[PDB]
Coordinates of C-alpha atoms in Angstrom, one line a residue:
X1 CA 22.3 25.9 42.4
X2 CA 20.9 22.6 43.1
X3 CA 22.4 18.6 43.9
X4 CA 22.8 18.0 40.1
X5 CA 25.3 21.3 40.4
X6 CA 27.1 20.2 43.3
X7 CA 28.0 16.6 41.4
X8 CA 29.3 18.3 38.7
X9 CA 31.3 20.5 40.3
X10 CA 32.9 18.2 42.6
X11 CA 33.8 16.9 39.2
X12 CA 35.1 19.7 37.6
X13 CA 36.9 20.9 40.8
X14 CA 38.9 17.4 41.0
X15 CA 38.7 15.6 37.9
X16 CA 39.6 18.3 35.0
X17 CA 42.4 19.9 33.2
X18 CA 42.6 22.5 30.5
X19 CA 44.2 20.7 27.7
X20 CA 45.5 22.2 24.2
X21 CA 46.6 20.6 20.9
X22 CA 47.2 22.3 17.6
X23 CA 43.4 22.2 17.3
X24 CA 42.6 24.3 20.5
X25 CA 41.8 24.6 24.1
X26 CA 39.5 21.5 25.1
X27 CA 37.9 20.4 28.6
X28 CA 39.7 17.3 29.3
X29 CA 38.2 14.5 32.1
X30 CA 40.9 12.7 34.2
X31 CA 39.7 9.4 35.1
X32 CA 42.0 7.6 37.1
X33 CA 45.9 7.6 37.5
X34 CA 47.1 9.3 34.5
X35 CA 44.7 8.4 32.1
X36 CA 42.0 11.5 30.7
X37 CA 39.7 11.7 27.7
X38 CA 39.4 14.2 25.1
X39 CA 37.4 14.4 21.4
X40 CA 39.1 12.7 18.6
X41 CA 38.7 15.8 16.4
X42 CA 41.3 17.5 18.7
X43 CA 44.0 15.4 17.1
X44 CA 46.1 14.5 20.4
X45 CA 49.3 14.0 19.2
X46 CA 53.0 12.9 20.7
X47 CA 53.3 16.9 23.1
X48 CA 50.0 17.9 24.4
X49 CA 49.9 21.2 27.2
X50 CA 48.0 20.2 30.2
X51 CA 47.3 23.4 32.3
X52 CA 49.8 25.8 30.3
X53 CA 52.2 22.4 31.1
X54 CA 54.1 20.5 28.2
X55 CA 53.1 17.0 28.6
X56 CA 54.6 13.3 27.2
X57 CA 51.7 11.6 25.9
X58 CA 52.6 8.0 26.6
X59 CA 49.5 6.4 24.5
X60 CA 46.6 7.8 22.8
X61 CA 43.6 5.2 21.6
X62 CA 41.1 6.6 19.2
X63 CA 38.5 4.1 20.5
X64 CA 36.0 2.3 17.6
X65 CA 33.0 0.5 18.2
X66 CA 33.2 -3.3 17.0
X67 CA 31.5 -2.5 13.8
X68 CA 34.9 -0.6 13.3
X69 CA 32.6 2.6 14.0
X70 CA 33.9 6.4 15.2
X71 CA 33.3 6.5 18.9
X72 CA 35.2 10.2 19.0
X73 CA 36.4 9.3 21.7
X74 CA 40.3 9.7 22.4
X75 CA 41.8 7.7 25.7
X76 CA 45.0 9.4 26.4
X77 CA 47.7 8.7 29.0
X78 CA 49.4 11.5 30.1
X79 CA 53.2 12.0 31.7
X80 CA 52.6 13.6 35.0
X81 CA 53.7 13.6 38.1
X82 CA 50.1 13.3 39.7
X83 CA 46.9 11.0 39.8
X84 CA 43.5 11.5 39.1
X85 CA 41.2 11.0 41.7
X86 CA 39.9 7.7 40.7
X87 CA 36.1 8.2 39.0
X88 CA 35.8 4.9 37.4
X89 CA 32.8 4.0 39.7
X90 CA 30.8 7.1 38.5
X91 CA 30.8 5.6 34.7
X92 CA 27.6 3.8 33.9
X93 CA 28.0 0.0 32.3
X94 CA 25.5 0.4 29.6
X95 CA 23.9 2.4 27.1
X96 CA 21.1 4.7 28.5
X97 CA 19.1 7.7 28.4
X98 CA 19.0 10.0 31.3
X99 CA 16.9 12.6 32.5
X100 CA 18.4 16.5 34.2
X101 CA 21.6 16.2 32.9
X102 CA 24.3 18.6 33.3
X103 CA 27.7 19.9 30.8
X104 CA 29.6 21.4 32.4
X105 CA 32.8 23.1 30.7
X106 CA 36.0 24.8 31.9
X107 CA 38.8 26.5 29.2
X108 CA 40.2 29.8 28.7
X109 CA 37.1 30.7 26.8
X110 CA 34.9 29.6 28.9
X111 CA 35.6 29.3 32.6
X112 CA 33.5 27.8 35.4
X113 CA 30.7 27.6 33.5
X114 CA 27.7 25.0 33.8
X115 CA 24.7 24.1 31.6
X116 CA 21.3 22.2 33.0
X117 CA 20.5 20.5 29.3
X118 CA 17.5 18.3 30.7
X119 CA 16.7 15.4 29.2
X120 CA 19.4 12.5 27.3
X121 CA 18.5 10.6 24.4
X122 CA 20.6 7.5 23.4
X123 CA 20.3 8.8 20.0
X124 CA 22.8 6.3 18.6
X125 CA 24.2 7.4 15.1
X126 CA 25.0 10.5 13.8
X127 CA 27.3 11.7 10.8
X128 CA 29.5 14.0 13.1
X129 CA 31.7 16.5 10.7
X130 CA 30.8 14.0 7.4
X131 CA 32.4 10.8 10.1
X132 CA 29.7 8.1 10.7
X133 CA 29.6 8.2 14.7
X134 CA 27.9 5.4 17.5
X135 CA 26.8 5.4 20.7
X136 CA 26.0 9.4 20.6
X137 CA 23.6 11.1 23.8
X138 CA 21.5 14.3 22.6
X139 CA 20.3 17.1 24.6
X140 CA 18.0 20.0 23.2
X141 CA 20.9 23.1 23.7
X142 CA 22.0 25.4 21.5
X143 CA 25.5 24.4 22.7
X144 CA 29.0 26.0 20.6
X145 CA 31.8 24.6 19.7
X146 CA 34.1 25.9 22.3
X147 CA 32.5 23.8 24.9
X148 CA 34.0 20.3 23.0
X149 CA 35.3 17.7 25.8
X150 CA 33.1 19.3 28.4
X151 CA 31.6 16.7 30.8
X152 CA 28.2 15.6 31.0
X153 CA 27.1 14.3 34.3
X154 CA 23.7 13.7 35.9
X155 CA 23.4 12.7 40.4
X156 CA 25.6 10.3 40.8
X157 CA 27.3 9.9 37.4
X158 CA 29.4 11.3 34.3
X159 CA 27.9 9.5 31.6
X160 CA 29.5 11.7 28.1
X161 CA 31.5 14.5 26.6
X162 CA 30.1 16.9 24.5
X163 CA 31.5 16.5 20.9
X164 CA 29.7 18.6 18.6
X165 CA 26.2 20.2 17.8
X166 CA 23.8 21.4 14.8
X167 CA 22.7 24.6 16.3
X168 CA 19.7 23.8 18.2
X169 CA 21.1 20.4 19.6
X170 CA 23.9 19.2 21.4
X171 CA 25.6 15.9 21.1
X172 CA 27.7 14.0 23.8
X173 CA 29.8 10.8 23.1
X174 CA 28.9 8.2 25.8
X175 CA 31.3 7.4 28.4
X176 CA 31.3 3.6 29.4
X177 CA 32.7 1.4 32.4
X178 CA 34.3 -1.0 30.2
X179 CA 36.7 1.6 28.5
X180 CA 38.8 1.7 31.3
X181 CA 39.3 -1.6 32.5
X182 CA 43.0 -1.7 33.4

């Protein structure tokens, strides 16, 4: 509906799969070459379907803050026989707040669908499912659980993926340049 739309979507349209563990259909963000992320609480394991697709995983990293802290954040690489559209560029370097974001989400469940959340917060910790979780983004949505892994993005950048919620908020985990230095 307006340029905040149109980034996401260019996003979506390019830079997303449909991925499914024993814990469910997830939004999943490709990044670059075969490398995607996904929530930690989807328990990637050694098989993972990628668009209806049986898929190798060749690694899967749940990533930890150097306080040995839950990022719920999962870094997986994936054996197929295409690349990502390379996206690293679009991932800011630091922790931030944000203002008009967008989530946008893409499953089974929920198809082509797209939320303006307004404003960010670097809201830091939360205790996510009774795990002690960093570098957490909050928006002010009454966001559901079937919209896990979906991508948060404002002009010009993807900056999270939504993770969980309490109801009246939603919670993003915050995607950073320096996980995917090669």
């Amino acid at each position: 509906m307006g340029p905040g739309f149109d980034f996401a979507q260019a996003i979506m349209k390019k830079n997303t799969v449909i991925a499914r563990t024993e814990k469910g259909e997830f939004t999943m963000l490709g990044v670059y070459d075969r490398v995607a992320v996904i929530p930690t609480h989807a328990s990637v394991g050694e098989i993972i379907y990628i668009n209806d697709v049986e898929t190798r995983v060749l690694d899967a990293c749940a990533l930890r803050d150097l306080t040995d802290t839950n990022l719920e954040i999962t870094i997986v690489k994936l054996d197929r026989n295409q690349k990502f559209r390379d996206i690293r560029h679009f991932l800011p370097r630091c922790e931030d707040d944000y203002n008009d974001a967008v989530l946008s989400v893409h499953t089974s469940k929920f198809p082509n669908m797209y939320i303006p959340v307004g404003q960010v917060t670097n809201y830091g910790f939360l205790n996510l499912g009774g795990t002690p979780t960093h570098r957490i983004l909050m928006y002010n949505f009454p966001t559901r659980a079937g919209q896990c892994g979906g991508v948060v993005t404002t002009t010009g950048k993807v900056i999270g993926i939504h993770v969980g919620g309490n109801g009246a908020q939603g919670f993003a985990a915050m995607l950073l340049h320096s996980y995917f230095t090669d």
